[PDB]
Amino acid sequence: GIVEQCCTSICSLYQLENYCN
Amino acid sequence: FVNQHLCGSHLVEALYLVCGERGFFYTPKT
Numbered sequence: 001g002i003v004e005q006c007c008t009s010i011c012s013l014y015q016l017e018n019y020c021n
Numbered sequence: 022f023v024n025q026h027l028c029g030s031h032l033v034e035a036l037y038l039v040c041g042e043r044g045f046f047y048t049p050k051t
Contacts, residue, residue: 001051007028021042
């Protein structure tokens, strides 16, 4: 989930946008 | 701001700025 993708590894805009409604 | 390790409030704030009027969901336990 978001923590694994963006906190413990380097985030990206692509990944952040997966969590927008 | 996006291309770094983002944790906790710092991650919530990035979601806020990127998603704008769409809003977002923050689910840390998945």
